[model samples]
Target: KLHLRVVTLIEHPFVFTREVDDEGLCPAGQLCLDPMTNDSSMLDRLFSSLHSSNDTVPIKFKKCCYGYCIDLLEQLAEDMNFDFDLYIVGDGKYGAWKNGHWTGLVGDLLSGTANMAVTSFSINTARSQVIDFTSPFFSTSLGILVRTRGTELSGIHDPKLHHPSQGFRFGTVRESSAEDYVRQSFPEMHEYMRRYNVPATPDGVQYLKNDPEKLDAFIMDKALLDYEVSIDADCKLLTVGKPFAIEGYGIGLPPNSPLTSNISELISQYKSHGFMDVLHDKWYKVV
Candidate 1:
């Protein structure tokens, strides 16, 4: 049988995992179970150990994301010495998009609706509590994006809102790491999101399409913040603001996957060889 194992781990930025058993704990129809018991041990071994021990049949790892993770995936294919079978899981209209509604994708992942995720997903402290993550392959610093003229006026963040501000809006993709970080960093902003405008992707399409005075800022990766400004006509990132968090990005897989150790070590070796830098310039920088 020409078998292919492909899965998605809901709106995960750079990695996704699949549920193989019907424990009745996961959402219905989402879990792919065998005729036996509901425990995941069988499925786990199939994806992780089967490669070397079984038929040497390479399993396809599906991820829904852009940026560094894509590079890492390609590099992984080359380094792992396996023929890759890639699949993308997500609604093209919204999943892995760059808009403010990325949280929806996260909900999908948390619910065990998809298999794997690979994106520019950051391995932040808060997210790790809920989901397992691989060793980070990229370091990401927080940054802000505002109008180009914003730098002229000092103190753009203005971290002194005495009352619960309810008018301003901050754009974030539905299920991206940037969205979670922004919420944790500025819980106060939640109240301001009355009829907040979330988008499917962050190509700044939502910002460009929607005309909302409440959208005072856009929170994103430092690299994305830079990319947004360089391409957009009027949109720009704030030059002055204290970035609250420093984090790293990684390829996320389901917990207890045996492949993680090998993948992590390969990533370390790959980085040392400077392939990541080459990718960074290719996708992150404006050519």
Candidate 2:
């Protein structure tokens, strides 16, 4: 049987556990914590590989930050000419509970705990020290999100009003790309937030139940935010005019690995085959 290993930092519904395996677990993957290392990891099988090979090989992987390493894992497998299953890393809520993934993500990678990483990871020189990356498959663009009714209150523009604060109290998943952009823009904000953290902004477009006053506007990926808004009521994405920050989303690979090229080729294929536009269409309208 093909067995794959993954070291994931469980971040909410994207990858998490309810009560027990038999409770609310999906058909594949187990979200549990690593007892020895005390980290949140998962182990599962990717649907693409379910019937690709008659036989399977064992694999090991890890997760971190605010995204998944699926692209990295797939690319490595394609390059290495091996087929294997993917596994969960550790406790599913490790990242969501208190942002543990960000602090330990680099540690896990440097220590060889995972074979590769696929995350909404940013492009930075420091990360290059411990790992390599494939060409960017996604790009980050931050925009302010507000309820449709709130637009009149903010008074900036018709469908694109935003809260005015020298340093707005923004809410986003910890270790997320949005948070990184905020930190870079307002260096003191991170420190200020640590000293006096603000309440989280409420922006649950997917949940279909939102209370606008509780959480002021927050920033997020333009497309993702649009997707969330399109699917939810009482909320509308405010055009920020331009992206506050732009970062490339890439697959983190082992240092000096040959898998990079193959991954890039796949990404190129994804673009050429209308997959990219189709994803946008799924999440957004003609806009």
Candidate 3:
């Protein structure tokens, strides 16, 4: 349906931009853009009237452009007879209820300002009550995103003694599951480690990098942390210790929307047909 809009965020491999240089860099050389600079031919397949009409749907994602979920959404729309438009969230908060109001993609969905959201948004009980979620398409967990090596001395016999303490500082995205977990699990965390809550995960990462003395660690989703580490060519970050509390990723929709049942059914069918497995392998498998 051309009427529905899909909301997303630019969260790297999940949704990111691919420049002509990026295609050329692909070792497979399948869709390399350099040699064949005039690549309008490929556009034929990318936009070959898969939807009801040629009128492109607008989708809102984070920042510039491109992401893995974008591919999944495109395929889903092609299969289900829909079109979308893409854009970025105005506030970029990922839809959290704060100060008596909702914000981000979830906020848009709640207020009927947007049609759908699929940027690795987690499906939690609190959010489920406010908005509808399709069957989970991905699974992930919480992790401590930290520098590859800490400034503290290494080779200690009792790790706990050398563990994070009052000397160190930690950071997490403000109004996020990470922040909630830290506050709840470690009520005394403030007593041991100085805490910084930033507007976004990348901001926390930047604070950690820019001020090692003030920011010692970051806590976020495991997959997202892993993705950041994978792209950190400098080997600056690593997911430390243990990961826990598995979470499910789902497509966000307005509360009680009929599309919820439709999307859920499609997700079930996709899973049974191994389509979800293929997507997981394509987006997550290291190979």
Candidate 4:
């Protein structure tokens, strides 16, 4: 109510000023309603965000469209009366701190090259220190990928489940939390690590299918594992073991962006209005 009163009392920047130019044109500070010529108005700014192919389903390469991320951004644009451009991330990274700099999507945000990132960006402490995230719209965690029954390898992920004397190979998506998890939680597996770290998850899937013996197991986000298991009927891979390092997924933004609070409020309204619930069902419902 207070916000409403403030907005009602105060007029926005749609007013005109009467300052003349050197050529005696309209003026220097006049309210230029022409969006194409108006450079001062925030509404005419060309907003942008990082794009990638490894995101969720419904992402069409030709259409320049993404899945749930697109949906969320489009909804925000619609509610706020704004537009944006989505571009590809050059390094295909989700922003990691390294060697005195940030890289990937987060890097772009910090550089002000991209307005926001809207894929399955997991919210963590390290990222929060350098960038900002709206309230989480999704929740997920790490999971293990392993072969189904009849394989020579057992499905259990614990170190005790396998023989200590025998050397075993493990796989994980490159530069991902899964790699960090292995390094931190199962450091002994370092010598046996086989990085399937590629932008595309299917490459790792293909690797497992090419030679089941190549990797005893791989770990990644449970949501990704679920997507693979759902689509690859021939692979016979299964997501085993419980998820760990629970995390929430959110839209990425520049640190201390003015849009941060506005977007947060919008997301809260989306939850209450059932818009977010509709998107969740659309993307994740069991077929």
Per-candidate TM vs. native? 0.61, 0.59, 0.73, 0.69
Write one digit per residue (lDDT tens) for candidate 3, span 1-287.
Answer: 55565556656567654432432222321111111111223323322332336623222111234456766676678777886644445566676677897777777677665688878787876687799998887788877766657743221122432355555666666666555555556656523433466777777777665554456666677878887787677887777765465688888888888888877888788889988778766766557
Worst 10 residues of 1 by lDDT: 29-38
Q: What's model 3's lDDT at 30?
A: 14
Q: If both were scored by lDDT, which would come out higher, candidate 2 or candidate 3? A: 3
Index of the highest-TM-score prediction: 3
Better of 3 and 4 by lDDT: 3
Instruction: Output the better candidate (1/4) by TM-score.
Output: 4
Rank ordering of all candidates by lDDT, starting from the highest = 3, 4, 1, 2
Q: Which has the greatest lDDT?
A: 3
Worst 10 residues of 4 by lDDT: 2-11
Clashing pairs for predicted structure model 4, backbone only: 174-197
Better of 1 and 2 by lDDT: 1
Cα displacement (angstroms), candidate 3, residue 79, comes to: 1.9
Model 1 C-alpha lDDT per residue in residues 1-287, reported as the tens digit of each score: 12223233222233323543343222322222221211234444544543455533232321123344554765675666644323343342212223542233233344443334455566766556545566777785666556555322222256432142454455555445555554556565543532453544453434633455335555556655655455556544443366556778766555565666877899788789987777767655536
Using lDDT as the measure, name the better of candidate 1 and candidate 4.
4
Report the Cα RMSD per candidate: 10.4, 8.1, 8.7, 13.9
lDDT of each: 0.48, 0.45, 0.62, 0.56
